[PDB]
Amino acid sequence: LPERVLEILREMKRERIKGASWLAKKGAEAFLTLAEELDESLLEDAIMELREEVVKVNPSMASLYNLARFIPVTNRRDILKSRALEFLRRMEEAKRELASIGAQLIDDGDVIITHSFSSTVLEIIRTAKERKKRFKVILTESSPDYEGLHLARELEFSGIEFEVITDAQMGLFCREASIAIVGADMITKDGYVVNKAGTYLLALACHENAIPFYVAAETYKFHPTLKSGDVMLMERDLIRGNVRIRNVLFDVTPWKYVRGIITELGIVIPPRDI
Template identity: 60%
Template sequence: MIPEEVLSVLEDMRSERIRGATHLAKRGAEAYLLLAGNLRGEELRKALREMRNLLPAVNPSMASLYNLSRFIPLTDDPKVVRERVEEFLSLLETSIIEIGNIGSELVDDGDTVITHSFSSAVLSILRRAMEKGRQFRVVLTESAPDYEGIALARELEKLGVGFEVITDAQLGLFARKATLALVGADTVTRDGAVVNKAGTYPLALACHDAGVPFYVAAESFKFHPEKSSDGMELLERPYSRQGYRVRNILFDVTPWKFIRGIITELGIIVPPKEL
């Protein structure tokens, strides 16, 4: 049986509106630490088996939750769980840093970088580029209806990076003024498609039309080992405005053919030439 405090963490994760897959992976790790602190023996093993269903179900569009649930072994020893959680968190932290190092080499002086939603990996790239002395500006969408872009604007303001916030509807207009596009990912599918905040696909199309290189920043734990683009479940949340129901599918799918490369902690993965 899953302890109530663990279920409470899962519920908090389910209601998260701003932070993405990396943040939720950290919260998932927290849930495992709580399990290890409350259970042992066969009770722990049963709970870990149940978590392999419960954790990915928090947000089926995020591969990080699925991969975390498989990274933790089915064991009756709390110490093993704690050690694996610590290993996962360490890998996560070093991955973000290395993506920043690798991705920052794509940012040149005078660039206008366009992005959509909030991504820890993209923020790491922009921070590292600034540390290297690059002079650039960022165009970011407000990312309605949860306004993740405003959260990113606050982080850029702290760093002293120049930026401009636009409405989502102006993606096509401002993509033509950009020199580089950087977005994060919640999942990279087996066939190389990227699942990310809805609006990513229109941005990729606009960049493709304007000849702007479109890059995705994604830690390797966001690569789903089983799901293909046509098999992804895209989470939808209830939403209404002025009394009318508004469809609110949180994610869309961008085919690999519109992506210049996927920046990972292991290097930049580029699509096959035939695409």
């Protein structure tokens, strides 16, 4: 693979805050750069190679798997770039339509509890505010990279009322919330939700306290064939205080704890609506 393609892949593997959305976009740019740098004579093999590499960046993200599958093995640069750009446009459209459907679900007076950082969830919240709905957000700092603090700074910029808590405090706070909205890295074929580690715990707490738990996920985050049991939960080396700490970054939440999945096509009920 060309140097510029490898740079983008390293930039992707290096990301700790931005979520699936940003990562998928970078994956697309990786294919664009490939078509712009290689000879149409080596393109087909290079594409298969890049397909494998993009998915390996984070096997817990269905968006990367769907992106790779969407890209054809072609010897034509223009077709390769066109498919990559088309996938991006589809992502953007899916996100804004989902945000609209999500903002509609939110009620005035709501106290929304969420976890980790999701570009889609942030847009749902910003759209709700734009529509003049009053509400408050409870979010977690999200260890170990604290992508949650990024969400906090975004909500602050938008003038939205929020409260930050530690991950361990989710049980104490689901109670004060009227609804839970989290994002997703993958929706399995059998309807389970793969998302940031700890999402499962929030789901359990919210169920015991009767707080509707919703998941926001564009259809490009749905894996067409992988079932919950075979999901690969990516792990990243973590050292703090000179001590090695296990760091499985993603978890799995059973559908029985999920009210519904907010998609660009409407709110779907797992697992029957698949």
